[PDB]
Subunit: 45 residues, 2 copies
């Protein structure tokens, strides 16, 4: 369910209105972290 | 709901396990673009 939002800019943008630019920057850092840990993980694989 | 998933590294990480790295990179790019559209949306409420 968090998946139809994240993968569609229109919905992501609408949901994003409930967050501040600083919170959005934090969500980005977190998501960046998850993605990177998943790349480090596919390579030792 | 999505706020708590995105704003909490632990919960966000669990959810991500259901996605493919490609789906994950796609998500990261979309969120990056939203963060960019928002910043750029704020320079015009300023200069204007």
């Amino acid at each position: 369910e968090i998946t139809k939002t994240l993968l569609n800019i229109r919905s992501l943008r609408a949901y994003a209105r409930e967050l501040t630019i600083e919170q959005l920057e934090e969500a980005l850092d977190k998501l960046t972290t998850v993605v990177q840990e998943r790349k480090e993980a596919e390579a030792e694989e």
